[PDB]
Every structure is written in C-alpha cells, then in structure tokens.
Design a protein around this ligand. Sequence first.
Ligand SMILES: Cn1c(C#N)ccc1-c1ccc(O)cc1F
Length: 245
Amino acid sequence: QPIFLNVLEAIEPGVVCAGHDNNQPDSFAALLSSLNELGERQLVHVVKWAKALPGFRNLHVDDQMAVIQYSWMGLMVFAMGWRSFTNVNSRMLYFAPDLVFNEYRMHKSRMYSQCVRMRHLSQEFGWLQITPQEFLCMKALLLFSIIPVDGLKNQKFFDELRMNYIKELDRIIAPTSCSRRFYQLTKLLDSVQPIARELHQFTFDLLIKSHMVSVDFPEMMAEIISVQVPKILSGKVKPIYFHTQ
Ligand SMILES: Cn1c(C#N)ccc1-c1ccc(O)cc1F
C-alpha cells in the first residue's frame, strides 16, 4: 500500500485563480498587483497543504509557521513550473488560468530575467521526464529545505522529518540508475533556491517602493516579505543544499 503517496495526491491543492482582468491592456501595476494577490491566495492553500502533510505536527507549532514562511516562495515557483509544464509545455508561465505570462508580460512585469529562469525550471520537468509522483515528493521536501542558521526551536524533530522525506523520495526512485536519478532530482531541488532568492529580492524591493509604483501588497504578503524575507536576504536564514553551490 502506497500510504505516503496517497496522502500527497489527496492533499494536493486544486486550481487557484488570480482574479486578473485580462480585458484591460497590460500595465506593470496591474500585473504585479495580480501576482501579489495570487501569492496571497496561494499562501492560504500552502498553509492548509503543509499542515496536512505526514508528520508535520511533530514540529513545534512555532517552527511550523517559520518553515512555511521561508519556503512559500520556492514552493510556489516549483508548483508554478509544474503547471506550466503540464498545461502549456513550458511555452509560457502558467501562474494561474487567468494569469498566463507570455514574453510581452515577462517584459512588462520588469522581472523578465526571473521569469526566464522560472521557465527554464519548467523546461527541466520535461527534459528530466519528471513523474507527477517525483514532483509531489520533491515539493513536499522543498517545505523542509530552508532554516535559520541559529536553528529552530526544536531542530531534532525537523531533522528527522526532513530525513524521512528524503527516504520517501528514495523510495519512488527505487543501482546506477537510481544513483543517477537521485543526483538529477537533488540538483533540480537545489536549482529552485537561487531562483527563489531572486524573487525574494525583487518582491522585497517592490514592497519598499510599492506606493511610488501603485502596486498593492495584501496583508499576509506584506508581513512575510517585510518580517521573514529580510531574514533570508541578510543571511540569517539559509537554504539546505544537497550539493555545494
Ligand atoms: C505569484 N507568484 C508565483 C506563483 N504561482 C511565483 C512567484 C510569484 C510572485 C512573483 C512576484 C511577486 O511580486 C509576487 C509573487 F507572488
């Protein structure tokens, strides 16, 4: 019985729309406001998803929140890359059904470079022939891939929970074929982190200058970006990497 995989498939968030008006000509303010609102909508789903993961409540309740808050960006990028792979074969970024980015929107959003990398991430799902099951366990493992340098309140329970998720990834892979596969997947998991960092910087700078540019940041978005993201950007909170960068 595939108990672990059953849980992941069962708790996997459905479609989330951004509420973007696609009848109005593209503007930087409207495009970035819709992404932020999508971020907010998505956060809600990421919280409910993470809280339903196997063993997640073994974590200290305060570590539960931190982990979600540090990981959210990378979790969203990775899932978005998947959506883009399965819906449009990575030809465009499928943020939401009502928010698909072509190259014009990539350019109008002033985050073309970040978009380029995200789309490259999406292409990798196709290049490496990632299975939905690999995707599911990789995404779960992403939640436990970023922690403070000073450690969590109960680090031991995190370490065990992360160890078990790596073991689960091992299992859906399962000797030279497996060692090759594990190498490829962990390299893929590592590649999400520099991308998330670029989006962390962009979203942070944007929050600071938000009033100047008429870009709206929803309550939960503005809080994380100003309280938790600077902890990452200042080097206090760091990715866990499989390979040396
Ligand atoms: C909505 N979204 C996804 C998804 N799905 C990945 C990255 C972002 C994002 C980008 C810039 C920003 O200012 C706010 C954001 F929420």
